[PDB]
From a paper:
We first measured the affinities of a series of C-terminally modified [name] peptides, including [name]-[name] (amidated), [name]-OCH3 (O-methylated), and AGD(v) (d-valine in place of l-valine). Both [name]-[name] and [name]-OCH3 showed weaker binding than [name], with 5.6- and 7.5-fold reductions in affinity, respectively, in agreement with results using amidated dodecapeptide. When closed headpiece crystals were soaked with 50 mm [name]-[name] for 2 h, the peptide was observed in both integrin molecules in the asymmetric unit, with molecule 1 in state 5 and molecule 2 in state 3. The slight reduction in shape-shifting induced by [name]-[name] is compatible with its lower affinity. The conformation of [name]-[name] in state 5 is similar to [name] in states 6 and 7. The main difference is that the terminal amide oxygen of [name]-[name] is 3.9 Å away from the ADMIDAS water, whereas the corresponding distance in [name] states 6 and 7 are 3.0 and 2.7 Å, respectively. The conformations of Val of [name]-[name] and [name] in states 5–8 are very similar. In state 3, the ADMIDAS metal ion position with [name]-[name] resembled that with RGD rather than with [name]. One explanation for the weaker affinity of [name]-[name] is that the long-range ionic interaction (4.7 Å) between the α-carboxyl anion and ADMIDAS divalent metal cation is absent in [name]-[name]. Moreover, [name] and [name]-[name] induced similar headpiece opening when soaked into crystals.
Author numbering:
A (entry chain G): 408 to 411
B (entry chain A): 1 to 454
C (entry chain B): 1 to 466
D (entry chain H): 1 to 134, 138 to 219
E (entry chain L): 1 to 214
Write the structure that this text describes.
């Protein structure tokens, strides 16, 4: 995912 | 207790090389002990930081050491209509070192890697890499299990599963007595963290220069997970090995995940197949429980015991106020097949921001009383905040609650005295095991020799 | 009859007063041989003792500064009074004690500073559109609670370094959103945008010119920003006499101390300012995230009330951090920050709904005890913190100071101060352990063994050296 | 030890489809790439395509786009090569290949799978004796085996007795049917003095004819 | 695609000899090349990868070398097992491509062929077919050309040739030429001949027979  | 704090020995590296960031004892084929030292900011050929390793021969006087040379050039290979790229700039070679047999493993956790295919790319990311050497023969090899040739688009289409692009393999490291290397990769599987294992023999025999992407069939990587408890846990921040299942033929792994379960932190004990046997949970959030782990039988029952560091633990004091001092947890292995219970002992720092428990080193039997002892570091501890190393002795019931000896940093402020430790090796061959202490902030290593007990 | 004063068989005027607070000493010459010189004050006069020669200190407590509590914190030049009295003189004889009172008021219409510290990582893109009118709307609702409001704005993302940051291709550095079909700002650790100001339309127009960036990992470097917004007094613009609210918004987890090692950063946070003329945090790529303890220190030091205004997915997380950073408040933010206005107002109310006393520089030998009077004249013994208060409310504490023995230093002073308050009560202590007749002693007196002693307080003492 | 055990020889008709296999032994199929290679006597070696059995992604030479379809099932540890709309040119030997260490190399090879595409029905061979014409110290006889399908055929003289001084030539495709010939040499005193027989067996149609060589 | 010109196509050499096979690419491939070995009537075995690296189990008498677009495989002191096919393969680009191949053959003294002609059997003729066979046994080198003649005139239609691999015993080669006609067409003519053209003789080795006459 990460920065979302 | 019987370490000598008067006549020390000092090894030193280049200014600003972080010489002493990692270290270990190294015995050649003849049994001559040396000290391997990692200096992750050592300049390379292009006058840019790349890190480096030093192999220091034992001399009571100390001094400068010769480099253990490794390839520092960026590599490139056009193959399979793809372009493989390795980038060693600021890779941090020597950010961890370990010795086993007549072999040295030094790792660069921040070696970057990218693959190009026409307009697409695998993204430039720090997969990390490990450099292996046999000094006496000059043999060299590498190991970078997290390297891949998958393109960025594919990872997106597969929802970033099994993403080893940021492993930073070599972050932590350890080698089993059987000669099996084990690398902690806190960035593996999108910052979940993974472990990578492979026999040292198979590494050397399968490595050839220029290939960059090669198969080590006997290797073994841990697994991705859908569990949010493991997200951003940095599983593999620290690693160790031991015997915890009663089976002497199997080797168990100890892994630290200091940000496990929303920064609660945790330590897990596993079999060689990465199946979980035990899990120790952090006592306090953001304490970084699992920053460092150590395995040694402290109470002399032949059963390995586990030590865990939480350098940012905040102790409860008067008027509902807290004070970051760090803490160490002792877990004594029970008789036969049983779960590790609550901590047998809690050691807590005293100096604010001292980071007591940043490093924990088995000393073997220091005072030769029959119980193995340990050394704990508070790199910014002591009354001056310059750093301290505290020795705790083994006993029939675990460890002594109070230190038997305290080593005040001989370096200036900011040296991080005690950030790296290693013991349980007799370097001057006097029948007493000794202690080496790294201080990368000062670019030096201090050797403490154990003497007969006064 | 005989008591602990006489039966103890003292030797001097000093030793007499140390027996018990009820004891007195007689320095008169014309006193019978058998009659003791150390007894109750009522007994000495009964035995024809000269009133002027009687040494009998009494523990007292008189006020020196007793300004009235202010009805309005509005205006003035920090002449606002929210603690009374502000200073008292205290006198104690050995093993004795004395009681005194203090009042505290959560003043109405007190100035407030609000620094909006906003996550502007890509996950917060939808949030930015919502708060494009916050400044004026926030002015409207706070105007009911203060006429001196100043607001400011700062933003963060994460340490602009691998692996947090996308570093490939070269296009990705100028535009982290290149591989998608949009543009976004290059990565930045933390940047100050708007210094605390009463002009609220400045907030709006600064926000309308802001946009998000994009990094790789979900946890963001917001604690770096909390630190700098705290220890950079002059740049953020915190006022001296004002309630300092630091509002922290984010929809994701946060990086903590020792996380920086994944970017090759090992240097501990030094707790100093590193935001220059370019209004960007310069030590972002070279200095590790701060620890909770270090943050707590600077928040407490600068009287900053931290407010976690986060989304439901991470409320539990910051609620648990909030317990590790006393005085910290938590509010639940919507997925687009639509309710951020009301969140702040409820936080400010919750902030000023408590009065908790704190003690500084209290001598070793002095011990204290408290009785709180909260709500409606309800005495709560063994307590020093009131809760469930509103603005304009008032409380009071009864305090007893019990001294142990007689210290070396006969004068000290400590402070009683509510947490987060400017004003305070300074207690000036004086230990009256000696007698006034000692100031007029007779060394090497003719009356004491041919000059081998000292004659003070009507009795012979062995001089120095014996 | 690494070994690639492919399927047995296939024998199919044109227009049909066939699916070969390549089972891994002593290792996991998922570890490396798995290539397929085509070999013909004239055209030589040709690369079909590859697959990563860990995810199923494939690559192909645009020559085989349409006919070749490579797949894999990690469960059975096997990799497959499907061929469709077969023709006479698809008649070839097919090998599966994986690398040793280098991700991109071609080091370990399976024994191979023979493929033959033909509309030929199972026909029995026509065995004909070959006697010389109406002198020297050395005499040469022969035996023709014409119009049989499919391969192979085992040929001997006097039922394995006479073995030395023999030349059995490879079969050749003559209009969808195979033709084979074998010669033998001895001294003049041996023939027609001693009886020499040509033993031909065609296990497919199960026929073991025997023709005695007679002079003219 | 990248072409791989492998040379020579074949070579006649003896045991203990040192030999070298070359391979030329249509462009640079930076050592991304492999060498293979296919023994007669068997599968392939890896020899080299990435230009110079020996596959495990391979003797050190093999060696790879070269760079850019020119590479070579060298075999020091040939063993009896080494006589086989060899192929180079590039994997610098997709699709992978191979060389034409190289076959190592046992060298020996030249030797003329023993020709033998055989008219159609009685069995075949009564079935409606007519096949004349012409064997050419035990010769060296392999380079040979056969020519069928009916009534002294060349005939190219209906010929079927077959060769043996180098015989294990005498290291020679053999060939089988077969002329097939219909029974009706076989009787239109009388003379049948097969001419052998070898380097051992300028004059062709002729053998023939006359139908009916015997
Ligand atoms: C923020 O901080 C809160 C407070 O610490 C955390 O909440 C706790 O989470 C832990 C783990 O998720 C919970 O631990 C479990 O407790 C159970 C018993 O609790 C009961 O009684 C309490 C009384 O107040 C109730 O509140 C609670 O709902 C329960 O009904 C045990 O059953 C569990 O044991 C099982 O798991 C453990 C490992 O976790 C094993 O060791 C055991 O053998 C067993 O298998 C467990 O001990 C705890 O109850 C939670 N407390 C509260 C108040 O919710 C949040 O997790 C934290 N969040 C973040 C994001 O940091
Ligand atoms: C705090 O409250 C307690 C009530 O519990 C006060 O104590 C009683 O006070 C009287 C004085 O009138 C004493 O005679 C009693 O002995 C006290 N009882 C106790 C202590 O149990 C106490 O005085 C209050 N303290 C202050 C500073 O006002
Ligand atoms: C001291 O205590 C008494 C009774 O407890 C009270 O009446 C008096 O006001 C107190 N003194 C002060 C200064 O508050
Ligand atoms: Ca075990
Ligand atoms: Ca033990
Ligand atoms: Ca010991
Ligand atoms: Ca020693
Ligand atoms: Mn984000
Ligand atoms: Mn969001
Ligand atoms: Mn982030």
């Amino acid at each position: 995912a990460g920065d979302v | 207790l019987n370490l000598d704090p008067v006549q020390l020995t000092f090894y030193a590296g280049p200014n600003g090389s972080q010489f002493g960031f990692s270290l270990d004892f190294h015995k050649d084929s003849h049994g001559r002990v040396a000290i391997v030292v990692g200096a992750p900011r050592t300049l390379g050929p292009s006058q840019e930081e790349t890190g480096g390793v030093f192999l220091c021969p034992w001399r009571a006087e100390g001094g400068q050491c010769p480099s253990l040379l490794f390839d520092l050039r960026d590599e490139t290979r056009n193959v399979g209509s793809q372009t493989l790229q390795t980038f060693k700039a600021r890779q941090g070679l020597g950010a961890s070192v370990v010795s086993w047999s007549d072999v040295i493993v030094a790792c660069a956790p921040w070696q970057h890697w990218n693959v190009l295919e026409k307009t697409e790319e695998a993204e430039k990311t720090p997969v990390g890499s490990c450099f292996l050497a046999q000094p006496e023969s000059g043999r060299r090899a590498e190991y970078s299990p997290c390297r891949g040739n998958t393109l960025s688009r594919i990872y997106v289409e597969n929802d970033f599963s099994w993403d080893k692009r940021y492993c930073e393999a070599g972050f932590s490291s350890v080698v089993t007595q059987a000669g099996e290397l084990v690398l902690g990769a806190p960035g593996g599987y999108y910052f979940l963290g993974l472990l990578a294992q492979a026999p040292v023999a198979d590494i050397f025999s399968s490595y050839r220069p220029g290939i960059l992407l090669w198969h080590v069939s006997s290797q073994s990587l841990s697994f991705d997970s859908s569990n949010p408890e493991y997200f951003d846990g940095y599983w593999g921040y620290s690693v160790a090995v031991g015997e915890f299942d009663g089976d002497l033929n199997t080797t168990e792994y100890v892994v630290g995940a200091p940000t496990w379960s929303w920064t609660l932190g945790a330590v897990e004990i596993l079999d060689s197949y990465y199946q979980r046997l035990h899990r120790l949970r952090g006592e306090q959030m953001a304490s970084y429980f699992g920053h460092s782990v150590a395995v040694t039988d402290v109470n002399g029952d032949g059963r390995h015991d586990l030590l865990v560091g939480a350098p940012l633990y905040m102790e409860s004091r008067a008027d509902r106020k807290l004070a970051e001092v760090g803490r160490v947890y002792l877990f004594l292995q029970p008789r036969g097949p049983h779960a590790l219970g609550a901590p047998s002992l809690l050691l807590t720092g005293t100096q604010l921001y001292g980071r007591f428990g940043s490093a924990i080193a088995p000393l073997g039997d220091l005072d030769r009383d029959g119980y193995n002892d340990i050394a704990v570091a508070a790199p910014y501890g002591g009354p001056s905040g310059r750093g301290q190393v505290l020795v705790f002795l083994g006993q029939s019931e675990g460890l002594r609650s109070r230190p038997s000896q305290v080593l005040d940093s001989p370096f200036p402020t900011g040296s991080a005295f005690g950030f790296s430790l290693r013991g349980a090796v007799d370097i001057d061959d006097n029948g007493y095991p000794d202690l080496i202490v790294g201080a990368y902030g000062a670019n030096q290593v201090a050797v403490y020799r154990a003497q007969p007990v006064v | 009859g005989p008591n602990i004063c006489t039966t103890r068989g003292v030797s001097s005027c000093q030793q007499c007063l140390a027996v018990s607070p009820m004891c007195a000493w007689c320095s008169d010459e014309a006193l019978p041989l058998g009659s003791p010189r150390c007894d109750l004050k009522e007994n000495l006069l009964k035995d024809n003792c000269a009133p002027e020669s009687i040494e009998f200190p009494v523990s007292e407590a008189r006020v020196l500064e007793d300004r009235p509590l202010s009805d309005k914190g509005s205006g003035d030049s920090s002449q606002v009074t929210q603690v009374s009295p502000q200073r008292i003189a205290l006198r104690l004889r050995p093993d004795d004690s004395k009681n005194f009172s203090i009042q505290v008021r959560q003043v109405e219409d007190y100035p407030v500073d609000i620094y909006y510290l906003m996550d502007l990582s890509y996950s917060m893109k939808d949030d930015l559109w919502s708060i494009q009118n916050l400044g004026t709307k926030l002015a409207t609702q706070m105007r009911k609670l203060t006429s001196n409001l100043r607001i400011g704005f700062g933003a963060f993302v994460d340490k602009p370094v691998s692996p947090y940051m996308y570093i490939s291709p070269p296009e990705a550095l100028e535009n982290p959103c290149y591989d998608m079909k949009t543009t976004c700002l290059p990565m930045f650790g933390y940047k100050h945008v708007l210094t605390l100001t009463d002009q609220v339309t400045r907030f709006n127009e600064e926000v309308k010119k802001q946009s998000v960036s994009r990094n790789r990992d979900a946890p963001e470097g917001g604690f770096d920003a909390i630190m700098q917004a705290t220890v950079c007094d002059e740049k953020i613009g915190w006022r001296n006499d004002a309630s300092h609210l630091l509002v922290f918004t984010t929809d994701a987890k946060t990086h903590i101390a020792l996380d920086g090692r994944l970017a090759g950063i090992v240097q501990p946070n030094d707790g100093q300012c590193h935001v220059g003329s370019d209004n960007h945090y310069s030590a972002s790529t070279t200095m590790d995230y701060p620890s909770l303890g270090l943050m707590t220190e600077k928040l407490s030091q600068k009287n900053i009330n931290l407010i976690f205004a986060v989304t439901e997915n991470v409320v539990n997380l910051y609620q648990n951090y909030s317990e590790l950073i006393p005085g910290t408040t938590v509010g639940v933010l919507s997925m687009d920050s639509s309710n951020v206005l009301q969140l702040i107002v409820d936080a400010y109310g919750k902030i000023r709904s408590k009065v908790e006393l704190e003690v500084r520089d209290l001598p070793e030998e002095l011990s204290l005890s408290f009785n709180a009077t909260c709500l409606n004249n309800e005495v709560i013994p063994g307590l020093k913190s009131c809760m469930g208060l509103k603005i304009g409310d008032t409380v009071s504490f009864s305090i007893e100071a019990k001294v142990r023995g007689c210290p070396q230093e006969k004068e000290k002073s400590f402070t009683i101060k509510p947490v987060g308050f400017k004003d305070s009560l300074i207690v000036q202590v004086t230990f009256d352990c000696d007698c006034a007749c000692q100031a007029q002693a007779e060394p090497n007196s003719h009356r004491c063994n041919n000059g081998n002693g000292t004659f003070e307080c009507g009795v012979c003492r062995c001089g120095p050296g014996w | 030890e690494v070994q690639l055990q492919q399927s047995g020889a296939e024998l199919v008709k044109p227009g049909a489809s066939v699916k070969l296999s390549c089972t891994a032994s002593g290792f996991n199929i998922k570890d490396t790439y798995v290539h397929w290679v085509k070999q013909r006597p004239e055209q030589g070696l040709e690369w079909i395509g590859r697959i990563d059995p860990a995810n199923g992604y494939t690559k192909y030479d645009p020559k085989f786009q349409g006919k070749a379809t490579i797949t894999a099932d990690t469960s059975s540890n096997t990799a497959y090569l499907q061929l469709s709309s077969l023709t006479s040119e698809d008649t070839a030997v097919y090998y599966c290949v994986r690398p040793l260490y280098d991700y991109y190399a071609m080091d370990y090879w399976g024994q191979g799978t023979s493929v033959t595409v033909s509309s030929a029905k199972t026909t029995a061979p026509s065995v004909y004796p070959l006697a010389p014409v109406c002198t020297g110290s050395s005499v040469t006889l022969g035996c023709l085996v014409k119009g049989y399908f499919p391969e192979p055929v085992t040929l001997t003289w006097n039922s394995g007795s006479l073995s030395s001084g023999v030349h059995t030539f490879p079969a050749v495709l003559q209009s969808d049917l195979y033709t084979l010939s074998s010669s033998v040499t001895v001294t003049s005193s041996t023939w027609p003095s001693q009886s020499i027989t040509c033993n031909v067996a065609h296990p497919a149609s199960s026929t073991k004819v025997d023709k005695k060589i007679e002079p003219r | 695609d990248i072409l791989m010109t492998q040379s020579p196509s074949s070579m006649s050499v003896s045991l203990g000899d040192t030999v070298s096979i070359t391979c030329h690419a249509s462009q640079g491939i930076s050592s991304n090349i492999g060498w293979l070995q296919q023994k007669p009537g068997k599968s392939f075995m890896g020899l080299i990868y990435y230009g110079t690296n020996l596959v495990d189990g391979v003797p050190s008498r093999f060696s790879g070398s070269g760079s850019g677009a020119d590479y070579s495989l060298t075999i020091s002191s040939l063993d009896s097992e080494d006589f086989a096919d060899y192929y180079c393969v590039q994997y610098a680009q997709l699709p992978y491509t191979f060389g034409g191949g190289t076959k190592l053959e046992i060298k020996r003294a030249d030797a003329a062929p023993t020709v033998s002609i055989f008219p159609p059997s009685s069995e075949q003729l009564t079935s409606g077919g007519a096949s004349v066979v012409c064997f050419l046994n035990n010769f060296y080198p392999k380079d040979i050309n056969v020519k069928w003649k009916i009534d002294g005139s060349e005939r190219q239609n209906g010929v079927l040739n077959s060769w043996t691999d180098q015989d294990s015993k005498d290291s020679t080669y053999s060939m089988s030429s077969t002329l097939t006609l219909t029974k009706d067409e076989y009787e239109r003519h009388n003379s049948y001949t097969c001419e052998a053209t070898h380097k051992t003789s300028t004059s062709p080795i002729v053998k023939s027979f006359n139908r009916n006459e015997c």
